[PDB]
Design goal:
The complex is a heterotrimer of chains A (217), B (260) and C (918). Chain A has one domain: Ribosomal Protein S5, domain 2 (2-Layer Sandwich), CATH 3.30.230.70. Chain A is 32% helix and 33% strand. Chain A starts with 22 loop residues before the first strand and ends with a helix. Chain B is built from 6 helices and 13 strands. In chain B, strands 1, 2, 3, 4, 5 and 6 form a 6-stranded mixed beta sheet that branches. A 4-stranded antiparallel beta sheet of chain B has the order 10-9-11-12, sandwiched between helices. In chain C, the strands form 9 sheets. Chain C has a 5-stranded parallel beta sheet, with helices on both faces. A 5-stranded antiparallel beta sheet of chain C has the order 8-7-6-9-10. A 5-stranded antiparallel beta sheet of chain C has the order 13-12-11-14-15. Classes of the chains: A alpha+beta (217), B alpha+beta (260), C alpha+beta (918). Chains B and C meet through helix 6 and strand 13 of B and strand 13, strand 14, strand 15, helix 10 and strand 21 of C. Strand 10 of chain A pairs antiparallel with strand 12 of chain B. The structure holds chloride ion. It is classed as hydrolase. Keywords: exosome, nucleus, nuclease, hydrolase, RNA-binding, exonuclease, RNA binding, mitochondrion, rrna processing.
């Protein structure tokens, strides 16, 4: 048994309500296996994402494919949700007569994979040099009583309703909104408010590494 | 859809009317019809017609979950997923008979007759109408592990229902409309499907691609949706009460528990 | 592997940190953390002076009671790691330690300091002792500037002030006020049990659990005069009240007297966690209690045969009503949870269930079912069935009463319809009995007599929905009096082998809650057609006597009749008419004739040793032979009550005889056994010791007379109390067919009559249905259904109706008990009670007005229990009341004053509305 949210506002891992968990990244993790590739740790989450770039079939478009491996229903769901997002988002009209194959491997998961999955893919594609409209970043919020908790580990998804959002750049428009368990209508908007800020931070963190890796050479 | 007919529908929405007369926030008049057997419901939405049939049989539970029964849906044209179970609409823990060894497996086979959109939405009314109109055999489970149960000898019992979730599907253009027809549906650029119950909780929301949508436009949708969901809940409830009355002409004279 | 982040946010929490208020961040609601612990804490002698206290985990587990005490721990720090270790050993105690923090105020204050999350305090065998130590150093260093010092109370440098609990308490100003701190035996095999049975060394029985100690039970056995006791968790061996059980006697070294302590599941072993698919913490409160009960057990005279349960032959398990233990549930977590359910029956243990909706169901009255109770689990395991609604809900309460007593409340089967008359409310008694169309539609009419000239009237309580019984009286030419009891002819309407009959048979008897009536039979019969309504022809079965000046029976006749009641009086309305000398018409004249005759009939029965049930308050603790539901507030009786009663009684007697004489095999009858003189032991011992009196048991007359002798010159009412108390000792009457017993066993003991049956109330009772059909046969009106000659079927009817009656009364008395509870709460009312029981840790009070018991518990009777005196010979409890300072003696039979208020239990997080002493 645990205390999900102390009255001193401290959670199981010692975070507060509006605090992300640790988020570190790498790009170009597989220079030969892929055209782009990313490795990403988000809390205890751990994902390799690989885009085997525009290759040889719509003549108007490129075709996109997300393949996600864990180490059946839930999987195909996760997949087809991510193909949908990144179909809108990638400029498939710049790469006609072509396939982009996104192959993911989830090494470890501990709450909010979907959000984690999104950030990984986004990183892999920027690395791929594939063009897209904006940068979608992903995140989960959960509702504890009257208080949103901003980045849910697995013990947190079990004890409260969760919302995942994928956010388009520094804007407030959502590419993806998945409200996954019950939330009172009169509390949804505030939860979305927190998702959007955390999502923005994730992007901000994402941007740093892309800055960093860019300075080597 | 011809290039013309598409130009005509799309322009009309830029003006801002819909070819069938109804407005952007308007859900097709819902027509619920109950059949002879309990659990047998037929829902009609403009030119969309769906039939659901609730069935029920002893099974067993999963080794994971000894203290709860099973609920399966199966659709077959001739989201829906989360809602029903997610809401605690159907209390699966109340379908446990003997922890670990015996329980109820409930089914809804949903069958689409004619489709003019509203597949997700009509499906969900159908299951919920079905689920609330259905009745279980009566069992005697004295014997600890021995289950007795029939049939006309005893009157069937309802399932206990804790929310009535309803879906409303918004189609978007490049501008949002509720319960698209098929032709409307084919030209849409994006989908968002809000489920709520009359208790005012958002049971589940789903949006993946295409048109990026504002926090406020989600909220705006949830409200437009809720207002509908009342009507449909009050409708489903009245049509049960009217069905139950028709089957029990003489309830009034038959009550045991009479007030002082 | 869990993540772990370290902080600089986390405050001292001392109202005098002046650095921490700049470490600090607003919470979600943009509110700065309120600092809790005081500027000026308790200053002890130095070194120490002004100090905060820092609790070790084992101090909390063993001494949570003393922590809750309002006179000792004022500023306390709970290291997060101690909070955690406590919550894993026992969630209930954790719950209680959080309440203390939460409820921090001017008197007492507790905080949690998250030692494991600060950069400063976190530490990397038992690391956890060093963890806690470092908190104290940090808080010492942190606080020095304000003269505040840390003390660490423990059990098992130094440079940190470190004291045992014993040692900390001794340093206090008011130091010397010190209330200071598994497997069941397998059941036998079949072959073994059977062995033991064949040799007479094992015994079959029905375990009744005692009503104030869920861990004491008894089983009646022929060999033994008093009930054989079964005492404790182990010897009870997972039985439930009701279960058929096999027992073995324990050696006499193990025999025990009836326990002197009260107990329930809610208040025993309260520190346990439920656990599904663990070193126990015993509270000091409990050690101390089971001490005192063992101390009493050492010395008592009058020990009785004790046994132990070796096999469960029949499990009593059904669906049970209960509400969750808030102390086992996390109210803000949507996870699935192992939790405890407290059942509504105080006899039962509590149940483990695992549920996805722990938090949602938390103030619901729910239904559950037991699945198993194996040797290696301290509690049964069950599973959630459904939610009846909220605990205040009232409609959810009615549903629970009915469920708990297995009373069916659903509507009547639609198969019943077809058996009621086609013409429903338009049904009419024929004008001419010899009418030919009528005679074809129903040929039995020829045998029906016409009593429409009889000046018949009825008398019932007011608000009577169904009129079963009616009466007339006419003076005969010769001097004698013709008298008539005319009963609803339900048997004309309710035919055997029909859905309608099957139903009433199944139901057995109508049921009455305070707010609700479960009908045995459709309203169309009971309220309309069968009821002997005024100014309407109505079929009846009539017993007409000719009675002499002395009330003797000169003859009797039985006949299906037509009748038409001239009037419907309530009892009061009847009393009025008779006492109105201006009215002297024939019907009135008969009414007065009834009363005078009735008074004699009762004298007849008193001189045969009938029990005096004149007081209405006594009348409640028995059956009512009219089938009248009890009132909540006991009304005073009038002459007319007895008038109606003695005549129903007479009709019952005369039918009993006739139907026996025609059918010695299978006459439907009611008997009442004389109690064993053992039942009265505790009463005469209470009566001697406290009152210099006693009740005599040679015979029911010897007793009746001895009650008349129990008179307290001090108190008039005492006498009636004694009566009320001697009735609890009486046996239950029971229905039975004549075949199963011999004649001198037919006796009704309390009514003092050779033979008896229920006949005057067929709408509300199925026994009278059967006796009507039987009488019909006895007079040759119509042949008896073969069903009612079939001993096998007639046993199954008897078993049932006795059960349904038992349950009916129990249902109805629980409804009253629940309403009196609300009425005293709602009206904040003060009422007069009498003490009928004294335990070491509570008393039981009767509230005469409502004729209801309740238990006032010891720690609801005093702020300090540990100083109380119990005397088992003197039937005396001595204690210091709350809101007062003087020692108080309470004894059995003491007139007290009582009231109801909402108490919140510190152990049970629940806030019920308990009964208190004014
Ligand atoms: Cl590589």
């Amino acid at each position: 048994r645990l205390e999900i949210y102390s009255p001193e506002g401290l959670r199981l891992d010692g975070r507060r309500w509006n605090e992300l968990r640790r988020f570190e990244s790498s790009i170009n993790t597989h220079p030969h296996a892929a055209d782009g590739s990313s490795y990403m740790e988000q809390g205890n989450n751990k994902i390799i994402t690989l885009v085997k770039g525009p290759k040889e079939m719509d003549t108007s478009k490129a075709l996109l494919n997300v393949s996600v491996n864990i180490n059946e229903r839930r999987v195909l769901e996760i997949q087809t949700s991510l193909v949908r997002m990144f179909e809108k988002n990638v400029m498939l009209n710049i790469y006609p007569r072509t396939v982009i194959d996104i192959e993911i491997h989830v090494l470890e998961q501990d709450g909010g994979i979907m959000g984690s999955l999104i950030n990984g893919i986004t990183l892999a594609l920027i690395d791929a040099g594939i063009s897209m409209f904006d940068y979608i970043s992903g995140i989960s919020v959960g509702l504890y009583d009257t208080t949103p908790l901003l980045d849910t580990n697995s013990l947190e998804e079990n004890a409260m309703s969760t919302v995942t959002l994928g956010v388009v750049g520094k804007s407030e428009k959502l590419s993806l909104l998945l409200v996954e368990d019950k939330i009172p209508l009169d509390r949804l908007e505030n939860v979305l408010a927190i998702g959007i800020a955390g999502a923005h931070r994730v992007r901000d963190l994402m941007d740093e590494e892309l800055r960093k890796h860019a300075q080597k050479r | 859809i011809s290039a013309s007919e598409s130009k005509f529908i799309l322009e009309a929405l830029r003006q801002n009317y819909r070819l069938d007369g109804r407005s952007f926030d308007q859900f097709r008049d819902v027509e619920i019809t109950f059949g002879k057997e309990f659990g047998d419901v037929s829902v009609k939405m403009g030119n969309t017609k769906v039939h659901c049939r609730i069935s029920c049989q002893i099974a067993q539970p999963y080794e994971d979950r000894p203290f709860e029964g099973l609920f399966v849906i199966s659709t077959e044209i001739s989201i829906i997923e989360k809602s029903v179970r997610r809401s605690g609409a159907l209390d699966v823990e109340g379908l446990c008979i003997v922890a670990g060894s015996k329980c109820w497996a409930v089914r809804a086979d949903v069958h689409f007759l004619d489709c003019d959109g509203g597949f997700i939405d009509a499906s969900c009314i159908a299951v919920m109408a079905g689920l609330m109109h259905f009745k279980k055999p009566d069992i005697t489970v004295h014997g600890e592990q021995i289950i007795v149960h029939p049939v006309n000898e005893r009157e069937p019992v309802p399932l206990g229902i804790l929310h009535i979730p309803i879906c409303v599907t918004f189609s978007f253009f490049n501008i949002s409309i509720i319960d698209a027809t098929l032709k409307e549906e084919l030209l849409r650029d994006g989908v968002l499907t809000v489920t709520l119950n009359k208790n005012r909780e958002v049971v589940q929301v789903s949006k993946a691609g295409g048109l990026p949508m504002d926090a406020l436009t989600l909220m705006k949708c949830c409200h437009e949706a809720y207002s509908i969901i009342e009507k449909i809940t009050d409708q489903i409830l009245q049509l049960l009460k009217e069905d139950s009355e028709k089957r029990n002409k003489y309830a009034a004279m038959l009550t045991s528990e009479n007030a002082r | 592997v869990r993540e772990h982040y370290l902080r600089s946010d986390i405050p001292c929490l001392s109202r005098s940190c002046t650095k921490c208020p700049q470490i600090v961040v607003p919470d979600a609601q943009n509110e700065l953390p309120k600092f809790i612990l005081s500027d000026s804490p308790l200053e002890l002698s130095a070194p120490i002076g002004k100090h905060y206290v820092v609790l070790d985990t084992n101090v909390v587990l063993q001494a949570i009671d003393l922590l809750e005490n309002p006179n000792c721990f004022f500023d306390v720090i709970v290291p997060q790691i101690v909070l955690d270790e406590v919550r894993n050993k026992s969630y209930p105690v954790y719950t209680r330690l959080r309440t203390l923090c939460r409820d921090s105020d001017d008197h007492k204050r507790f905080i949690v300091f998250h030692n494991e999350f600060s950069e400063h305090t976190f530490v990397e065998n038992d690391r956890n002792d060093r963890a806690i130590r470092k908190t104290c150093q940090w808080y010492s260093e942190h606080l020095k500037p304000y003269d505040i010092n840390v003390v660490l109370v423990t059990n098992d440098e130094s440079n940190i002030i470190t004291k045992s609990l014993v040692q900390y308490i001794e340093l206090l100003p008011n130091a010397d006020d010190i209330r200071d701190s598994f497997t069941f035996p397998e059941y036998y095999s079949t072959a073994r049990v059977m062995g033991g049975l064949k040799n007479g060394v094992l015994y079959q029985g029905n375990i009744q659990i005692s009503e104030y100690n869920f861990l004491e039970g008894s089983v009646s056995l022929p060999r033994f005069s008093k009930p054989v006791l079964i005492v404790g968790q182990k010897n009870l061996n997972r039985a439930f009240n009701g279960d058929q059980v096999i027992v073995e006697l324990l050696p006499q070294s193990e025999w025990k007297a009836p326990s002197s302590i009260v107990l329930d599941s809610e208040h025993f072993d309260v520190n346990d966690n439920p656990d599904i698919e663990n070193t126990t913490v015993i509270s000091d409160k409990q050690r101390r209690l089971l001490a005192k009960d063992a101390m009493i057990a050492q010395r008592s005279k009058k020990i009785q045969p004790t046994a132990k349960v070796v096999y469960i032959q029949r499990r009593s398990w059904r669906q049970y009503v209960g509400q969750l233990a808030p102390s086992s549930v996390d109210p803000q977590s949507s996870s699935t949870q192992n939790v405890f359910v407290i059942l509504m029956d105080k006899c039962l243990p509590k149940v483990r269930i695992r549920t996805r909706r722990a938090a949602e169901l938390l103030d619901k009255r729910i239904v559950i079912s037991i699945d198993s109770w194996p040797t290696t689990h301290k509690y049964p395991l069950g599973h959630f069935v459904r939610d009846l609604g909220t605990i205040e809900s009232a409609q959810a309460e009615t549903e629970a009463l009915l469920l708990e007593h297995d009373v069916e409340y659903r509507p009547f089967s639609k198969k019943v319809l077809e058996c009621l008359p086609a013409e429903g409310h338009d049904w009419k008694a024929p004008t001419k009995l010899d009418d030919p169309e009528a005679v074809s539609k129903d040929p039995l009419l020829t045998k029906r007599k016409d009593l429409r000239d009889k000046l018949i009237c009825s008398i019932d309580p007011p608000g009577c929905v169904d009129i079963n019984d009616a009466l007339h009286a006419k003076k005969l030419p010769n001097g004698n009096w013709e008298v008539g009891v005319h009963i609803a002819d339900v048997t004309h309407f309710v035919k055997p082998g029909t859905a309608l009959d099957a139903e009433g048979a199944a139901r057995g008897t109508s049921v009455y809650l305070v707010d609700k009536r479960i009908d045995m039979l459709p309203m169309l019969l009971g309220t309309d057609l069968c009821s002997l309504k005024p100014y309407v022809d109505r079929f009846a079965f009539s017993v007409i006597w000719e009675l002499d000046d002395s009330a003797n029976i000169v003859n009797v006749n039985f006949m299906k009749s037509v009748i038409r009641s001239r009037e419907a009086f309530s009892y009061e309305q009847a009393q009025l008419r008779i006492d109105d000398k201006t009215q002297n018409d024939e019907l009135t004249m008969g009414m007065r004739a009834l009363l005078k005759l009735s008074v004699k009939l009762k004298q007849k029965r008193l001189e045969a040793g009938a029990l005096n049930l004149a007081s209405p308050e006594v009348k409640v603790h028995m059956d009512s032979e009219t089938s009248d539901p009890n009132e909540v507030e006991i009304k005073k009786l009038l002459a007319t009550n007895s008038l109606v009663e003695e005549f129903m009684l007479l009709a019952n007697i005369s039918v009993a005889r006739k139907i026996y004489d025609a059918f010695p095999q299978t006459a439907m009858l009611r008997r009442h056994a004389a109690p064993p003189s053992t039942n009265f032991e505790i009463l005469n011992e209470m009566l001697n010791t406290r009152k210099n009196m006693s009740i005599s048991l040679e015979s029911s007359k010897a007793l009746a007379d001895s009650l008349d002798r129990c008179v307290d010159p001090e108190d008039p009412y005492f006498n009636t109390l004694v009566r009320i108390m001697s009735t609890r000792c009486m046996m239950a009457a029971q229905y039975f067919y004549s075949g199963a017993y011999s004649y001198p066993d037919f006796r009704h003991y309390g009514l003092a009559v050779d033979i008896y049956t229920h006949f005057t109330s067929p709408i509300r009772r199925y026994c009278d249905v059967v006796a009507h059909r039987q009488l019909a046969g006895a007079i040759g009106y119509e042949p008896l259904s073969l069903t009612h000659r079939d001993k096998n079927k007639m046993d199954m009817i008897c078993r049932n109706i006795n059960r349904k009656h038992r349950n009916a009364q129990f249902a109805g008395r629980a409804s009253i008990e629940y309403y009196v509870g609300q009425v005293m709460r709602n009206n904040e009312s003060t009422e007069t009670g009498y003490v009928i029981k004294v335990f070491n840790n509570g008393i039981v009070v009767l509230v005469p007005k409502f004729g209801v018991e309740g238990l006032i518990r010891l720690d609801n009777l005093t702020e300090d229990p540990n100083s109380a005196a119990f005397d088992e010979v003197e039937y005396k409890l001595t204690f210091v009341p709350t809101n007062s300072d003087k020692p108080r003696d309470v004894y059995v039979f003491d007139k007290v004053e009582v009231q109801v208020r909402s108490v919140m239990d510190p152990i049970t997080s629940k806030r019920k509305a308990e009964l208190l002493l004014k």
